[PDB]
Amino acid sequence: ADLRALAKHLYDSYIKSFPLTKAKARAILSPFVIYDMNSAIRIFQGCQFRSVEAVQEITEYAKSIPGFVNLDLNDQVTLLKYGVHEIIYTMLASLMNKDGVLISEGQGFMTREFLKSLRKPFGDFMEPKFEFAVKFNALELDDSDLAIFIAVIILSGDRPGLLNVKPIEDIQDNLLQALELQLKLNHPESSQLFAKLLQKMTDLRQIVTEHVQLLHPLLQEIYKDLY
Amino acid sequence: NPESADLRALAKHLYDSYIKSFPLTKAKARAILTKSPFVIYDMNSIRIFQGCQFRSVEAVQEITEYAKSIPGFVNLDLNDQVTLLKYGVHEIIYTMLASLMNKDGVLISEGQGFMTREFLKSLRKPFGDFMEPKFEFAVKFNALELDDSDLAIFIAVIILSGDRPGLLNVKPIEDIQDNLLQALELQLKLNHPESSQLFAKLLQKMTDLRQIVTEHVQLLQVIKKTETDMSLHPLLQEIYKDLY
């Protein structure tokens, strides 16, 4: 059918857009372990720099989603604006376990306790994403499921200020069918995977809103607006 | 298929419990909105907020009665019963509230009145924005064209969520929600054969549900201290105490 072609195309584009896949993360999870100060504001700013990296990679991945480049430009702008943060957290889950997260494209690993011990502002920076990551990682998704999931996420017709919702929901419809079939084929004995996955978007958005809540002139200019 | 039959029996039980638990259903509300209400559209007729607290508390009682009928719920560990009710009852209040709203206003007083959206937008201090997020949700949610038989399973699903903060025995809850989600899927396929992937879109609406409740929590924090003379009910106070 159409849905396996769509799923293979999306998987191939995910492999090509994202250097460090979930499979490689699971493989690792040897990295340099950062467990304390001997191994503040530098960690937070580094996370924002990695985030701008990732925004660029995600936008490139979005352009490969069939139909997306054809949409009205304002609607592509606002879909990426509100989608990239939820996708960043979805992809960050791939790099985490209960004890820490892999950083630096897989060569480092920083511990959850070292992150939890930072001074007042930065001590809760990461803790909601660890709490979420444990739940999301319990779904035991792999890369081919995530490739379709994040596309679904990008094609969300509820973002405020959308000009033309109809083609976007049409595409998300195709994607949703493709995802449902992908999860039936890959996870036979995972009874209601589709529904549980869609439920996870509620925690995704709650993370995003809480993180928005918590939040050199040329550098200031590069790393403003898209977080 | 033999399993679809079991899901049908579950759906029928849930629907029957819904009808028994909520005196004013979506069907009656729609019938009244299209036997006719008195309309309130300006002052000529703080008080409204206390009315909303009285109705909220009554809704909490009705939803607790419904919850007791969801198969398995009363057999759960009493602490998880308290946690699920604490985290689910407001999502359910806004869900059922959408049934009573259209673009222009909302039914009040057991259906005998209708208060206009603009009037509710014109209220003083930080009260003008009380109903707006609800009207904005209601317009999108009513667009799904759900009926009582769909809603009855949906709100059960909303109660039995295994990601609620602080649950002890997640396993029985995810088993119940798995069952309820199969039941809802079947019901929506049979009852709305032509609406494509309605199940996915309904499940996606839970996101806006949670955004409504967390924004209402903030607004509540801003409301209670401006007017130290205002009063909050212990039931709602205890539901909001911990939270997020």
Ligand SMILES: O=C(O)[C@H](Cc1ccccc1)Oc1ccc(-c2cccc3ccccc23)cc1
């Ligand atoms: O959240 C809920 O339980 C309901 C939901 C709901 C929405 C619409 C119609 C019916 C019910 O909203 C409420 C919002 C406000 C107050 C309230 C009343 C009196 C004094 C207050 C002082 C500080 C804060 C809140 C106060 C009660 C319920």
